[PDB]
């Protein structure tokens, strides 16, 4: 925040930066999964192991 | 890294590895909330410029 940068912005450019941000947050999910799926499967071959 | 990680987990016990397992999932989810959580304040300046006009 940002703002005072921001409230000097064109409607349409607000609203470009703000769909951008969706993608973004989806990335970062996404590799949150990806880093959980990192954890899962090592311990699922651990069981599988005995 | 991964193998250090393996064999970590392949001497405990089937009790603490379901144990574990379990405990991802929830995990996962409360990081996911935080994350969501920071994009609402992230999202919070654009709309109120959006709103000042």
Known sequence: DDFDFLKNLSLEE????????????????????????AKRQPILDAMDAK
């Open 14 to 37: 607000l609203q470009m930066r703000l769909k951008a941000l969706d993608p973004m947050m989806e990335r970062e999910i996404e590799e949150l999964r990806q880093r959980y799926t």
